[PDB]
């Protein structure tokens, strides 16, 4: 197909020395892919949270262009 790469443009909101388990990362990943992208090209704005703490902002981009879309991170705090 045309889209061959997914990009994440991120920025730190807060330092957090913790790390999500594989189970948590998988759930995050599957949710976005299945319910957000729905197997289509698009752009998502997101925030990784640790409980109630807002930790990291990421703009996820899936487009025809294989090149880095650049731009700024976007969030969903």
């Amino acid at each position: 197909g045309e889209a061959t790469t997914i990009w994440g443009v991120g920025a730190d909101e807060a330092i957090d020395k913790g790390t999500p388990s594989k189970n948590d990362l998988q759930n995050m990943s599957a949710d976005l892919a299945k319910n957000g992208f729905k197997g289509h090209q698009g752009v998502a704005c997101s925030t990784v949270k640790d409980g109630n703490k807002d930790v990291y902002m990421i703009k996820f981009s899936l487009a025809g262009g294989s090149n880095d879309p650049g731009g700024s991170p976007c969030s969903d705090d």
């Binding site: 197909g1 991120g10 992208f37």
Partner: protein, 63 residues
């Protein structure tokens, strides 16, 4: 830990290449959706160093 998200831009464009190791976790049937999930997962894991120590950047993964 959770990922709060919103679609800034939604499309019905399905032109996405296949991949190796499409995800089968979280009830995914491999396939294109699994390719996207595997891509998101790698990007999230990569960013762990940036929430641990600060900083930003652009991370990619084949899909």
């Amino acid at each position: 830990w959770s990922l709060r998200w919103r679609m800034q831009k939604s499309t019905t464009i399905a032109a996405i290449a296949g991949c190796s190791g499409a995800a089968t976790f979280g009830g995914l049937a491999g396939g294109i959706v699994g390719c996207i999930a595997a891509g998101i997962l790698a990007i999230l894991q990569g960013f762990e160093v940036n929430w641990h120590n600060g900083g930003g950047g652009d991370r990619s993964n084949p899909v």
